[PDB]
Amino acid sequence: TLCLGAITTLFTALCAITQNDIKKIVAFSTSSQLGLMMVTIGINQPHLAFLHICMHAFFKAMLFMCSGSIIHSLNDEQDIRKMGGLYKAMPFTTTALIIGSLALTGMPYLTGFYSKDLIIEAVNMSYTNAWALLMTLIATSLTAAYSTRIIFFAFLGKPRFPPLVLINENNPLLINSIKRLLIGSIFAGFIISNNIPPMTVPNTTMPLYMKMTALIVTIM
């Protein structure tokens, strides 16, 4: 199970970094996170895997909804090469997508942190296959890489869509749904972590560099 999860997360994160359809990128991201869950199961931490399922649901659904908002605004266009500067033209969608990407990369104290960070630390401190550990670290770097690809190509720079501009996200249904999922993606990690009984023994003592491994690889 551990080796299957490691190869899955690495291969899917490696495929995701060159894709041009936004739905394909998010789907490969989902597959890579499922591989990480399989890795977590493989190191005998099922409750951490369940917590990661619960954490990932929020921001993954929000990211897909933001992609759908972009697609509907640009006349059902899904190629990121034809999406230009939506940072100012689509402010709320930009905010939601940025928060979702930060949560997906395990940025501290967001929803994705409370599961992914612990998963990486548990993988580091266990008697495990070394190649699986290396592929897990490379995959968690590639996660930030493809998140950067999505943000950079979809929201920064100059427009690349057809000149008849129909960009409009002012609709209460879209705003309310995304706002609910955004509140979840900000606070659910803390709320759920502080309200469950501890079913696992915490890794209290670790070398400082191995405590910062996830953050460092994400930054690189």
């Binding site: 649901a57 659904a61 909804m65 509907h72 249904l173 879209l174 759920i192 469950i196």
Partner: protein, 111 residues
């Protein structure tokens, strides 16, 4: 009678009502998507209570309500496990489904 079991069963049961109404004069009108979305939101709000009970006392259950059939020594019954995994996953899935249904009310408006 310890409302845990009744609430856990009702959360799942009320989700099937629009399925039974799919042959009434609400499936032919433009109010059906809102009706389904409201049903899902109510289900989420109801399911929030067994989660609170578990977070308070760690209460867990199994409910074997209907006996379907029995082989010679193997008994097959409709049974539901209401442990931590179920009572944690149900509200999350219901919340996500509520948000996505409200989103679909706008995304698939021309369908």
């Amino acid at each position: 009678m310890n409302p845990f079991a009744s609430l856990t069963l009702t959360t799942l049961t009320i989700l099937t009502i629009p399925i039974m109404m799919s042959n009434s004069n609400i499936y032919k009108t433009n109010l059906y998507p809102n009706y389904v979305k409201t049903t899902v939101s109510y289900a989420f709000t109801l399911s929030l209570v067994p989660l609170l009970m578990f977070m308070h006392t760690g209460q867990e259950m199994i409910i074997s309500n209907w006996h379907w059939m029995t082989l010679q020594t193997v008994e097959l019954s409709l049974s539901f496990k209401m442990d931590y995994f179920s009572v944690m996953f149900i509200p999350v899935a219901l919340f996500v489904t509520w948000s996505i249904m409200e989103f679909s009310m706008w995304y698939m408006h021309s369908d």
